[PDB]
Design a binder for these strands. Structure first.
Ligand code: ZN
Lengths: 132, 98, 24, 133, 59, 213
RNA sequence: GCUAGAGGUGAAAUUCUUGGACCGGCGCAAGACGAACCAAAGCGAAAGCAUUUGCCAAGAAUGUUUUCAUUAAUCAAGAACGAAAGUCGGAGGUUCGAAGACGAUCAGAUACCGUCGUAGUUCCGACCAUAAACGAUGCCGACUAGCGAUCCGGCGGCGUUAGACCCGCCGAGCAGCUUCCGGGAAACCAAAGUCUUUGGGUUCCGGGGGGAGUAUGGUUGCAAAGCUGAAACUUAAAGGAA
RNA sequence: AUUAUUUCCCAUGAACGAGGAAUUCCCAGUAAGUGCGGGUCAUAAGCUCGCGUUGAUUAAGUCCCUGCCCUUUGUACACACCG
């Protein structure tokens, strides 16, 4: 029976979204931060709030939490997502093209291209799955 | 109120169907309205398959099965809990349970 | 029941007829 | 029987398993001569338990020792369930009597269901509204 | 038949009408094979050694 | 009061030479007391033996009926009396979403045995078939059934009882039907499901012993 | 053939066995029925219709660069067919089973349940013409969406198999589903849409709930009853969907 | 104070040898044993409300029973099945 009420969790998320730079992985440090940045009428509620802040702080360091939305955290994680390979995955040496697709390009100005490799069309129209 | 579109039976474009008898109570039920169930079970159940296999005279003899096609009326199929009453939207599901 | 009420009616018509044929 | 090296002398055990009683009828290989036939009623006082699985255990253990006295060591199984238009499912004493045959040191072979199934039944007992118990 | 000695490795769940028998997959200690499943009565945990009087049937 | 099984002799049952396993089992009968000859109680028994217990290694879903016709010195001599498939075999071949073609012919052999062969055949679903049902039309069923009438009659009316059982230990009469009906509608389970012996000629000890030679 | 029990029920009893019931084997006879295959599949105007084979005369759909040329649509009167039960006369009566008897259960059962069992159920001929005879939805015609299947016929396409299967199209039909086509009181309906933006043609039929499908008259029938069919009087609701 | 208010002393020494069908309470300083205090009280506890003392067995599980809750379903009920 260690489930936190919505009072503990909501107040812990607002503290993070407003004072993320002051919090850490230590309960007793966050226990004193929440005591000052938030007027909690009880001490047990403060320890529950600060204890859940420490839990959420261990999740922020590994990834984004579905409840906490920090602007300075979302912008950096999106900026650091810019990953591209040394060579694109689209410009290939050879490209397999179905004979029906080859005819579509033939109607367009791109009739004959060296990058195109016509594949043998498989015989037998067994694409549908059996019924029942 | 019309509770079912098929009126509780798989009869479409057809006047009359020959009836059958429910296995619990021998009552006249149409063949399409009957809640059929083709049960295939072994003659020897799992609680006794060990003793019968070790007492066999053959090296590898597979135990046969009982191919019985059971028929149920609407009333007895529900008392025997082979079909349950479903939600108003769940009734439209025609897929057999997994 | 509407069917047993219909049966009681036909059992009453058959009595009114026989009572009417007696005085015919 | 003139048998050697414990060679199996196969018999035929007709097991009439119904919902009111359970027959354990061991015959010869042709099925004409009867060796021993013990039913559920011959082993239980109350007639409500003639079809119980416990009654079939006593009916099968009693018939097994009789086959031991006549050199019958193996048995072919012929399981039937009331045939006709009645229930095609064997009664409770079907698997109980068959397991008790193997539990009594008797060999089993060629199990077969011989429930007489009609090409189409006659008018079955009970009205068109069935047994309204 | 001898009295086999098995060791509890995984506790599956609770069986029985009142949940008095615990279904446990109990393997033998003489060899890694024969990871049979047994029904145990009483408090069982991973690491217990059971005294199987009969080890043929699984049940 | 006295045990009746102390007055019974155990007789041997010998199968015809069509099979390798001759001694199929043992039967018992009361001793010759008064006028009840022990041979009289044996000359009418029918033994329903499975084909796996028969000649060498054949299937177990086919059964052969062997009726005892003459007893010769503590061993019973049986002859062919019928053939039928097991209950679980026939009940498993009858599946849904396909039609079954049944046929029967009352055609006698060359020596006098009037047989009634029962054939069954189920439509086969193709390997690349997307359709759920494999139903043959009515005229296709008639052409398949007429093929069974033609092959079953031709296969037995030119042979005697000894040669037709040699065609029944394997599914010879059923395989040629499946190949012939393949151009009409492909089939997969074509068997002679039952063989009834309707009429038998006069018993001859010379032909019986020839059958056990 | 071997045995004292079998039948039946929630549990029992009536009942079958003082011995040869039940059970097993080889058979035989009669009368029903046509399992599984058998499906939201087919056919028929509906009712209805399933073993094989033969015979008889019909039928839709499809195909048609065949023929006739408005011969059509719907229908008072009139007429054919019309489940089951019932009625009459024959044949047959295996099973089942109204009535009836008896055994259970209950306070009582004249019921449900069990053991029997008449009529009936079966066949032939003559009646009856009523069903929740339902898709509770007249028939004909046009138009207004899509999709995957399915039955029949036709058409052209890789390939596999010895017609079967595969991929599409067209017409016909039984259905299914998704949709804010629209409609509706809503449930729901590709029709129950195209409806105050009201009119394609036509038949039958409804007018608060009871009285009442009763009375009376006529008509039909051997009968049971069918068809046609009121009023006095009474009532502020009855009812549908959600 | 007799129909003994309580209390003391002497004497009297009964059923009761763990208890049928059933059934109750209870998971740790808990059950149970043990006594104390309060309430009632002129007289006053076999009751009850508290208190400490000694101090476990078993269990960390399940819908089997018996209780309610919820969803689905049905309703001619809506004074709502005591309909
Ligand atoms: Zn029923």
């Amino acid at each position: 029976g260690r489930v936190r009420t919505k009072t503990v969790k909501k107040a812990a998320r607002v503290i993070i979204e407003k004072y993320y730079t002051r919090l850490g992985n230590d309960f007793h440090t966050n226990k004193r931060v929440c005591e000052e940045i938030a007027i909690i009428p009880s001490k047990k509620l403060r320890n529950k709030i600060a204890g859940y802040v420490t839990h959420l702080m261990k999740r922020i360091q590994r990834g984004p939490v579905r409840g906490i939305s920090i602007k300075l955290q979302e912008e950096e994680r999106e900026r650091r997502d810019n990953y591209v390979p040394e060579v694109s995955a689209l410009d290939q040496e050879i490209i397999e093209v179905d004979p029906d697709t080859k005819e579509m390009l033939k109607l367009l100005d791109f009739g004959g291209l060296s990058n195109l490799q016509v594949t043998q069309p498989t015989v037998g129209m067994n694409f549908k799955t059996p019924r029942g | 109120t019309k509770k079912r579109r098929n009126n509780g039976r798989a009869k479409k474009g057809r006047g009359h169907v020959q009836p059958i008898r429910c296995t619990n109570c021998a009552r006249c039920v149409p063949k399409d309205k009957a809640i059929k169930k083709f049960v295939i079970r072994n003659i020897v159940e799992a609680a006794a398959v060990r003793d019968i296999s070790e007492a066999s005279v053959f090296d590898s003899y597979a135990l046969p099965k009982l191919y019985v096609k059971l028929h149920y009326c609407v009333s007895c199929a529900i008392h025997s809990k082979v079909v349950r009453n479903r939600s108003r939207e769940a009734r439209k599901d025609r897929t057999p349970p997994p | 029941r509407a069917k047993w009420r219909k049966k009681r009616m036909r059992r009453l018509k058959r009595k009114r007829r026989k009572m009417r044929q007696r005085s015919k | 029987p003139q048998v050697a090296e414990g060679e199996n002398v196969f018999g035929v055990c007709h097991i009439f398993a119904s919902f009111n009683d359970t027959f354990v009828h061991v015959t010869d290989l042709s099925g004409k001569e009867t060796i021993c036939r013990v039913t559920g009623g011959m082993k239980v006082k109350a007639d409500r338990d003639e079809s119980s699985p416990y009654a079939a255990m006593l009916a099968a253990q009693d018939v097994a020792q009789r086959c031991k006295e006549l050199g019958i060591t193996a048995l072919h199984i012929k399981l039937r369930a009331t045939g006709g238009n009645r229930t095609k499912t064997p009664g409770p004493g079907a698997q109980s009597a068959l397991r008790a045959l193997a539990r009594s040191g008797m060999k089993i072979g060629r199990i077969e269901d011989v429930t007489p199934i009609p090409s189409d039944s006659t008018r079955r007992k009970g009205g068109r509204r069935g047994r309204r118990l | 038949q001898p009295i086999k000695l098995a060791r509890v490795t995984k506790v599956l769940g609770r069986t029985g009408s009142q949940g008095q028998c615990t279904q446990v997959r109990v393997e033998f200690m003489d060899d890694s094979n024969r990871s049979i499943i047994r029904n145990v009565k009483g408090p069982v945990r991973e690491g217990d050694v059971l005294t199987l009087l009969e080890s043929e049937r699984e049940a | 009061i006295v045990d009746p099984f102390s007055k019974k002799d155990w007789y041997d049952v010998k199968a015809p030479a069509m099979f390798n396993i001759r001694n199929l089992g043992k039967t018992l009968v009361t001793r010759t007391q008064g006028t009840k000859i022990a041979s009289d109680g044996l000359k009418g028994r029918v033994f329903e033996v499975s084909l796996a217990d028969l000649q060498n290694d054949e299937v177990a879903f086919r059964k052969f009926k062997l009726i005892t016709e003459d007893v010769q010195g503590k061993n019973c001599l049986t002859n062919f009396h019928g053939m039928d498939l097991t209950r679980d075999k026939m009940c498993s071949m009858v599946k849904k979403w396909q039609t079954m073609i049944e046929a029967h012919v009352d055609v006698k052999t060359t020596d006098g045995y009037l047989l009634r062969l029962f054939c069954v055949g189920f439509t086969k679903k193709r390997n690349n078939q997307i359709r759920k049902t494999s139903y043959a039309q009515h005229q296709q069923v008639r052409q398949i059934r007429k093929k069974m009438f033609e092959i079953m009659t031709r296969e037995v009316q030119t042979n005697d009882l000894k040669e037709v059982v040699n065609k029944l230990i394997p599914d010879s009469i059923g395989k040629d039907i499946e190949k012939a009906c393949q151009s009409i509608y492909p089939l997969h389970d074509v068997y002679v499901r039952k063989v009834k012996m309707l009429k038998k000629p006069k018993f001859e000890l010379g032909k019986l012993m020839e059958l056990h030679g």
